[PDB]
Structure 1
Amino acid sequence: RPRFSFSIAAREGKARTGTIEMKRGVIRTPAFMPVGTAATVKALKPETVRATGADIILGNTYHLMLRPGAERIAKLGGLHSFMGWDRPILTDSGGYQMSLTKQSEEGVTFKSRHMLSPERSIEIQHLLGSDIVMAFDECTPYPATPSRAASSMERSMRWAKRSRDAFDSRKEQAENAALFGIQQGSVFENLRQQSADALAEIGFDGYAVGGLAVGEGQDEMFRVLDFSVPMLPDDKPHYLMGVGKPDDIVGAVERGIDMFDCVLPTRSGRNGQAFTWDGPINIRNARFSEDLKPLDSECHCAVCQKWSRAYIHHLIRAGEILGAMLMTEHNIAFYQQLMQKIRDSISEGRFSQFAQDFRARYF
């Protein structure tokens, strides 16, 4: 394979399906990336993550720089060999993870003390051996005034240029990894346009829509996507950071998004929430204590082939680790089945019907 090649095999409206080819493997798009923040997708072996259909997972510069350390992981052979995942890994840059500081034009120092900057973020992502490196940005808080959103976006665009130059100055990274830029501008069309233009002038391998999934709510998120995604280069992947619930994913693909991540299937699975095609259920509810059906009636995952709602109910109520394992495997497999149904429906020219059907039943 090449360092990076995105090809679009079929289209319907603004939706696209295709493939990203990288040295460590092929990513089918639209893609959902399970989140592996501490060098693990919580409660799953990497072979189980792959068996659900994932082609790529997400890691985080911020978390891994703190524990176990980026230089440590490099000394141990990089993130892929450390955790036993040999396929592509995308790493976020630390520009969100303000969520968990002294800010300046140079970067951010935060509470031991640590520092991140465009140069240091890109370096950490190199030490980890990331395949898709995210530019170092500022996720603008929501809501933001137009002035604050503009200042923040402008700084992020200067940081995007510094990110590009830091990545390109490291020959091994430039030859083997890809770099994505992150659009900012909050909910304001003109600032989203200025940001898209800045990013396309610099030039990246892919373009993320940043600054969403920060409390704005679906209607607003969709309105911003309606004008923001068309601003990005059409021939590169479009990544919506941190999204989301199954309905959010379907509507975002209808608006031109190719890549997704979120902790909802893993985190809410450990808390008892199971996704089904008839909507989410909370397995802790006493109504499931003698329910012999699988979590979902159609799901092909190994959990639904083997165990009942009643058993998983018991495990979660008892605080047993196997309950977290089973709930997480099912929810990640559900998300991957959703992405496969989206890909196949776009490929067959029937995605808009799929999206309507999905919603009618899920709600």
Structure 2
Amino acid sequence: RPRFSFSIAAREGKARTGTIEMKRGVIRTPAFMPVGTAATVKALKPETVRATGADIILGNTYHLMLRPGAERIAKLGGLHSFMGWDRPILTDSGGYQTKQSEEGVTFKSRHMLSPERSIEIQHLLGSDIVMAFDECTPYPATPSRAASSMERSMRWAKRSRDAFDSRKEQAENAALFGIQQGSVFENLRQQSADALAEIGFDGYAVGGLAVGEGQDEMFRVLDFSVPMLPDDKPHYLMGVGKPDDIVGAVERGIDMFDCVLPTRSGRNGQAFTWDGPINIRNARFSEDLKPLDSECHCAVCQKWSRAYIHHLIRAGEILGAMLMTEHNIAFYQQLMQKIRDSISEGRFSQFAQDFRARYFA
């Protein structure tokens, strides 16, 4: 396989479906990435993550640098070996997680991150898709502060590029994505886009969203923001999101996604279904022999009832967290597959309308 190759196989409006080829495997787009911030997708074995259909998982520079240590993981053979996932891994750079200066950020032991240190940690982890070190701009932000923050992030983007490129092994076997900032402001988003494209990356993330602005506002920004990015490279919406966020985002040109919701909300009792989420702890499920969802093909829905999973979660049993998470990740992957197939078949717009009609009914 090449280091990195993104190919678009079919389009409908702004939506795209295709593949990213990397040395460690292929990634079908639009893609959902399960989050595994401490070198584990919570409550799942990697083989289970894979069985659900995930092509790639996300790791986090910040968390792994604190525990178990980036150098430690390198010494042990890298993150893939350590956690037993041999397919691509994307690592966030820490920019979402202090003493701040133009040089970087110190967290308090006390810990330092910068473009250089972030990129190095990602190299020590052995990540396949490396994210530029940025500042995710808090929301709401005044235009001045959004601009200052965006500007610093673009300088940090160039520093991330150069650090990555200065490491032969990394530059030859991994990919590097830039992150667009600019808050909700079109001109800032354009300036950031231009800056990133001038540097040049393998992929472009839309950063700074999902941090309190609401879906209508998020979609609005995506409306003008994604067309600013190079069309021929993947578009990644960081940390998004609920099933309906994902559908709308793909409608606006997004190709990649990650979110803690399927895992986190699973362990707390929320199960995604095609009729909308349910909280399995609700007394109405105590004697419901139906599976979590009526159509889901996952192993959990093949074998156990709502009633059982209800008992498990109420009892605080670990099996409840395992089953809830396997289902929700599988659900998310089935959503992604339905999106890919519908775009490939030229009926994605219909799919999204039908989806919304049922999910919200």
Query: What TM-score bracket applies, with the shorter chain setting the length?
Result: over 0.9
Question: For 1:93 and 1:204, how far apart are their aligned partners in 2?
Answer: 15
Question: For 1:193 and 1:125, how far apart are their aligned partners in 2?
Answer: 28
2:127 paired with 1:127: no
Gaps of 5+ in 2: none
Question: For 2:318 and 2:96, how far apart are their aligned partners in 1?
Answer: 29
The Cα shift of 1:134 comes to: 0.1
Deviations 1:306-354 (A, max 9, x none): 0000000000000000000000000000000000000000000000000
2:21 paired with 1:24: no
Deviations 1:108-158 (A, max 9, x none): 001110000000000000000000000000000000000000000000000
1:195 aligned to which of 192, 197, 201: 192
Question: For 2:330 and 2:337, how far apart are their aligned partners in 1?
Answer: 10
Identity within the alignment, %: 100
Question: For 1:310 and 1:108, how far apart are their aligned partners in 2?
Answer: 48
CA RMSD of aligned residues (A): 0.2
The Cα shift of 1:263 comes to: 0.2
The Cα shift of 1:76 comes to: 0.1
Q: Which runs of 4+ in 1 moved over 4 A?
A: none
Give the equivalent residue in structure 1 for 2:215.
218
Gaps of 5+ in 1: none
Question: For 2:151 and 2:273, how far apart are their aligned partners in 1?
Answer: 42
Give the equivalent residue in structure 2 for 1:209.
206
Q: Secondary structure at the residue paired with 1:122?
A: helix
Deviations 1:216-237 (A, max 9, x none): 1000000000000000000000
The Cα shift of 1:31 comes to: 0.1
Q: Secondary structure at the residue paired with 2:133?
A: coil
Give the equivalent residue in structure 2 for 1:6.
6
Deviations 1:51-90 (A, max 9, x none): 0000000000000000000000000000000000000000
Deviations 1:241-266 (A, max 9, x none): 00000000000000000000000000
Give the equivalent residue in structure 1 for 2:151.
154
Question: For 1:10 and 1:251, how far apart are their aligned partners in 2?
Answer: 18
Question: For 2:145 and 2:166, how far apart are their aligned partners in 1?
Answer: 32
Question: For 1:156 and 1:275, how far apart are their aligned partners in 2?
Answer: 35
The 5 Å alignment of 1:162-201 reads: 162-201=159-198
Question: For 1:144 and 1:269, how far apart are their aligned partners in 2?
Answer: 32
The Cα shift of 1:186 comes to: 0.1
Deviations 1:165-205 (A, max 9, x none): 00000000000000000000000000000000000000000
The 5 Å alignment of 1:1-363 reads: 1-97=1-97, 101-363=98-360
Q: Secondary structure at the residue paired with 2:274?
A: coil
Question: For 2:106 and 2:323, how far apart are their aligned partners in 1?
Answer: 39
The Cα shift of 1:212 comes to: 0.1
The Cα shift of 1:298 comes to: 0.2
Question: For 2:83 and 2:205, how far apart are their aligned partners in 1?
Answer: 26
Q: Secondary structure at the residue paired with 1:180?
A: strand
Question: For 2:215 and 2:4, how far apart are their aligned partners in 1?
Answer: 32
